[model samples]
Target: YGSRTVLVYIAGDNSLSRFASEDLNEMIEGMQSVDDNHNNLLVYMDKGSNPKLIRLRKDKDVVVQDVIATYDAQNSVDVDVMKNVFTTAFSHYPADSYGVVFWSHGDGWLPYNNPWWGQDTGNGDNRMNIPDLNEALSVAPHFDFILFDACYMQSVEVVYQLRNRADYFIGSPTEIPGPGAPYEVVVPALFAVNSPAVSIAENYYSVYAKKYNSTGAGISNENWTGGVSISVIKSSELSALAAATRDVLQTISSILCYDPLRENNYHDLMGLMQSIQGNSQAFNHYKEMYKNAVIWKNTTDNNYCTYSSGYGKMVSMDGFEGVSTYILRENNSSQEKYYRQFVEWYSAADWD
Candidate 1:
């Protein structure tokens, strides 16, 4: 039978435990959208004191959630652990097409000094980076889409790492609200029988767009004032986008932006291209490729990108690209350079 299986891998073993509960409640309520016969919704959550796998199924015409399996306290970000979770979710509930939602703390493709990917405070402060994440997700199924419900996950570097893993990527290039996507709204779109790729992206932006400039809910609380921005990247167009970017970088010898958050030279992809492309003929090709890669994008006037500092400001999104990148320079710090050694994007896009 032609069916879809969407697995939500929630690595919420840290400060996000509370918000995870709220989103979980929303997801449960959203279960009404799942087709009992065709689609399967599986969630592997590592929160509180234990981690468990859950499946929402239909029983006697009523939606019922069941804990299919339970595991001991393990670091959720471990590569082996992550792979096992994906394998388990797939083998247990196979489908024609699969989609996975990576839910946790994220920092684009930046290798965090403290922690990243998923923050497991209980597991000796464990974290997972992008390269490791790509390796961990090497299960059987080639996903139709991978939606990230984490901060700064829509970066160009990330898309490159995940190019072969999924067909479409839906995420924000900036810090999302701590509460993340209102699952009550997004879960239904995600389970749409036809195609949920664009719908998922649209629904994610819908909740934040509803309360622009109003201090209703921020990552930390209901006191956030800025709005949100998000995009849908077609992975098939990445090679062309990368080729165009390499051409643009051919003449860029030196440029830098000192960031206080990571204290490295990282910039928005579209903004950087616009600033330097400067009517060059190569830029025309690059622009066309960009239009193809970034299939769908939406943003509010301002974005709250307070990723870690907690005091981040709401910057204007007048020319936002919805994708961030690490601009390689001659003066990369040892930490930055060391981290850059493993990213697949740098190998293709950056001239080392």
Candidate 2:
């Protein structure tokens, strides 16, 4: 292989795993064939079930892989693990680019105390938070992009947090089913150039949406009944957009207090003024209408979920808490009665 290396880290334990192991086996096998140019470091966090990092190599005409690192399945995908992986592999690869993939559970802007961890149900969940994730990547500069295979990962807060570290990011603003990515077509898709956002989004969905939907995998099977969406929101445009979104949200909240039924559609209220992209086609017209109106307000009902616009609103993962909460005042005092408070909070952001 050449000096460039692609680190494929699949970090998650399937203690109560419902899907067959053969499914995962096939996914890992697909990784080996992604590209012939670089080496493959496939790390599976079977730490609890079967923790080991396997090094797959091309021998003669076939690919052969062996175990390189094995933990007692107790180590988390924490800061230390991230540092070691980058140091040992990336330092030697000396490539023109690098790509990192995170597979786990995620909540957009919730604090660590929020209590949900990605996938694992046991006492010690091996999920990584934003701050810790940033610290881990701070050591490594300019990655092509970081693709999140976890759920509800594509939120403004998340994008802002990692804006400086990565050129682009790829993930959905909703829950991704347990089956996750269909590796069959994704491996070849990885070779479609080193651009982070474009490759992962195209490859991941090419298999995920078409296969999952065609076979009716997302039907009565509630657990697997989820889809993915992708979009590239420029950071420069994002800060301003967020401020505008906040203003729009507060105004709606105020209008609702006087005429509560105006916000009858919880889904629309929750999703109103959100970033326009991927699977959000239904709301596109409403977004445009609201944006262009003399006074932005809610009218229609896309009622699907709940709304607690205390903090402003955020986009979280699906099934767990996949809704966006804002950074506004608590609804306890007299000030909460006025709609103007919401507008002020929305427009008050002082960006650097």
Candidate 3:
């Protein structure tokens, strides 16, 4: 096999999963289309209460070698099995570039009551938490890209926590369909490029939109269809942006200066940035605030929903707000006290 390697892992369990099976099949078909020199590692694990990875290769075009099917009755991934798979891939088909696509349930920070969590509780249970995932990712050196094919995973906290483990990241701030990536289109491009981080991310949403449109599904209402926004900021640039935002926050403390706290009250950061001279305008506000602003607006609703003050229909802090992951949640009793705490405690805080 050539030095190019792609690892696709699917840990899916759905009573009503939209595209889990279809997505997995698509990946297999895409891999078969590539030349033999290209190596594809496939791991299909079923970790729910009823777990099974059925193997059926009816298509003559698909070629998957040593397909590993894993099962666990405990409703959690077998860490040993995962380690074995990674060890084998790392040893046998070492590549100049690598990408990992994780297809499972996620809650961004919430981690509960999400479909990607493997087993679903009526109130949303049986999902993997951030620390557990971080530990898993820390097992290996950084890869080219780490794509989350689930929902609410692109939060600043998620990216910052896992930043060192990959060169680039791709995910959404909202719930995405079970058909995460367009393997038919993405696999070809992935093998074609030296770096497929940005291309794969872009192609994901593009293909989804095209497919939805072709099926006569309107963009706004199709739950199965949505878009992804990519922010290709370096670790250092992200730190600088955080500092700038913090400074802006300290300066814009008086709620009286801005509109009343609506559900968009959590969008205070955007409001703070608006106070910046050039960024004052509503349009291009976030762009003017952060040195890099890249947003792929979904035909669907905003990427997230919140209990915070209302800003707008699109205004959301989906991945940003949660219990443990820190952001400026509430102003302190005094603005000065809050500002001091923010700069001292959070100025240099690690992203991931």
Candidate 4:
């Protein structure tokens, strides 16, 4: 196990097709960072039609891809299909460590989804849930890191659920800026000698932060208008985060809904901790635990506040602290039953 292999899973067969195409080229541009003999770069891209598992190589200045395997039109989120990709990559190119870049559409960890994987059939409902994802990866090696390049995936629940599967999880708790993580920088970070996970987070955030107020960072060549938010989670510290959350949340009656109006039970873990720390002692302890768990987090001044509809102007990130969560609210009975039943995070947190 001398080499490390990383897979970029691009499930962009919808409106995000163009961005997916652009990002792939960025990945090719960044391919020079990949070590030809010591490291491997693989991709399972299902963009236009036929899904293919490809191996990336840097030939001088040009990046070349070799199609490892191909599949008929298949839903990328299908458990069997996802497992096949993981198993195929691992079997073909054995590595000491593996990284997964989950690039697609997502909306936190609810039964509701936004095509977390590409749609196979003409139907638009080909998404996956938390458990199915866990099962899908069972056949593969325990990943070194899983970088969710999708939106609203940096949730305490989602990270906790996959704690055993991966060491670090990097993603955005809020809807990420259009045209996602800049692969030109991120791809190199993934192949970093040390701290690849944190490097990926730092590089992704760096690019956006530099172009924060410009159209260069967004889709349709539109201005970002708001800054980006991203975080890196040390999976091993998840239990500590969950434990602290349980104790702190019990003392509080109701917490602020990070995503208001839409009634989508999205709450920023750090924001909840800071805003509703009515109990100074227990909450203080929890805050320290949070600092340990969310190893790296970055947020700019404005968050755009454009979910469901639009918040019009920018919303202050003063209270936002990355890593969105699902907190049981007084009127959130709809999701309460769903969480306690389907999602392991609610039960794992011992919130009920």
Candidate 5:
């Protein structure tokens, strides 16, 4: 048990396993460079073939470790396995304050349906849904911050589900670049005593921005545009945001309706709220609160995605104060029924 340690849970047991070594190596290098004798960097890696826990050392030249244990994770997506990994990390490195880095695939707040490597990578198409994640984290100790190195994890639903579990949540609402966080620059920020979570998030964006602009080549030939979207959510403000959301929902319950089959049916929460012409004052207050809840956010002018229709364009986070989407409907049906359940899973406030 130490005073402070950051745990990086790398579930690279699926298709992404090929890049596991590269990411792990980069993180190890970062740890070696920044960490002193006082801080610790711990990692649990399940690379489909071998699963091991290692305490990274600053003085070591090679990526050697005091191997804590070696076991088959059975399936990385198993909630029990996730819980076990957290328990093991905490037992090995008990800390006054802790940070978590979940490195895997993410699908925002999509309902949990068993999909291979959806949230974690493993042998089967097994993945932990938001409920599964909630259950898994319930057994583990609270974290100061949780950084999702995976994609589409910054959705409001996902943040709200884990609100009580972590003080801060750092992630992207869109598909994160395949390279993920530049751990070499981003990891060291976790050690900062003041606003470490904010620092880590800001550093991540800055690093990517630098990389994106450094290449003089045209966007066509470039590996990536470096266009990234990230947000740092202060979980304390989530309750207020939820309250405001409930108020908005009640006010607009009579007006908001949409056909699920329509092209614009899936609307951004903030955008939809802003589009309501009547509820100006209430919506304005909610917008302000929503912006405050997401204490930090960064978006590039360049296209976030060059393929997808919805996100293919440049990042225009203008009306979308909250970087999440929701289904808007007035009556109960298959679509609304499912959406109702989705809302309930994240917030207790009455939305209908």
Candidate 6:
């Protein structure tokens, strides 16, 4: 509708039903309040039941004509279905720049070989791996920015896989709250003409911090640590970051990193490097390169556990670096073998 259009594809046909519906409503309200003279907000939502493509305007929300036939997107993880959604949106609302948002569950780089990042239980628990996601997105036009409104998406492996598809990547490296991004604030910022990605991420952090009191001392009445983490990565500089990472990895053999048995499935890349007693020069070089590549990152001083029983208790995350990395554990030979295929970009960059 304007020079820029933001496409929000909510794959909500899963266990995240309630939160997804609530977030969509918040986004609708956010769009209703914004002055939409120069930008458009297009949404392709499948809330596990009713699926539709609606365009939100300052005046009213309008359903696009002739898209219901394809509303039954059985598997959101299917590459063809994803490609179709993007192609349809682009054809209908061509713009100078486009921003894409993927709203669903994410597991970062874990579940290695397949590496499930999204889920659609209604479609037989179908999901997409990192390689599949890359393939799906490659068919779409280059995006100005791509934001993941899901948990554990800001891993180095995930970003590197999609480095060529989008100019910038915005998401959290750790578990996101059930509500996901505060679309009420994030949606408007995504429409901004300049630095929309950064603005959206900043607004997200501010909203979450204020709502959850992330800077405060101790857990809240919510019975959980309240905090949010986010980062903005410049895709163009990822190659340099990868090169530096390869250099660092080559300098040390079998660095004592986190193992799945002790640590979370994913560990902050910068944090892991800090924990390892490796060559300081190599570590510092990689750290500097990582900082440069990640233009902006923010994490709360305290940590929050999304689940209370299964994982553990309230964990402290005093020094998080806003991006996660996968560790290849020596004990899990099969997992390490599967991980080899998962680390395509890292391997391509010649990292051992």
Q: Count clashing residue pairs per candidate.
A: 2, 18, 15, 0, 1, 0
Report the Cα RMSD per candidate.
3.1, 9.3, 7.7, 3.0, 4.5, 3.9
Tens digits of per-residue lDDT, candidate 6, 1-352, equal 5778788888888878777767777787677546666677878887777577767765456422234224754666678888888788877777788899999888776553322588877746777787888888876879999999888888888898888899999998777766778788888888877798889899888876775545344454332247778899999988888787777677522232222224446776776666652688888888788888899988666545644243433345655667777766666566566668666665965646
Clashing pairs in 1: 178-219, 216-222
Q: Distance from true position, residue 119, model 5, in Å? A: 4.2
- Best by lDDT, which number? 1
- Worst 10-residue lDDT window, candidate 1: 252-261
Question: Against the hidden reference, what TM-scores do the models get?
Answer: 0.90, 0.64, 0.65, 0.90, 0.85, 0.86
- Estimate candidate 5's alpha-carbon lDDT, on a 0 to 1 scale: 0.69
lDDT of candidate 1 over 260-336, digit per residue (tens): 25444446787778776645888988989999999888988777654345566665566666677766655757746
TM value for model 1: 0.90
Off by over 4 Å in 6: 60-70, 112-115, 213-225, 252-263, 275-280, 307-313
How far is 348's C-alpha from truth in model 3 (Å)?
A: 3.9
Winner on TM-score between 3 and 6 is 6
What TM-score does model 4 achieve against the real structure?
0.90
Across 104-146, the per-residue lDDT of candidate 3 in tens digits comes to: 7665533232341234332344556554566666665467777
Off by over 4 Å in 1: 60-62, 112-116, 214-225, 251-266, 307-309, 350-352
Model 4 C-alpha lDDT per residue in residues 186-262, reported as the tens digit of each score: 98899898999999999988877876653323423344546678888898887887788788877722443445546
CA shift of 234, model 5, Å? 0.7
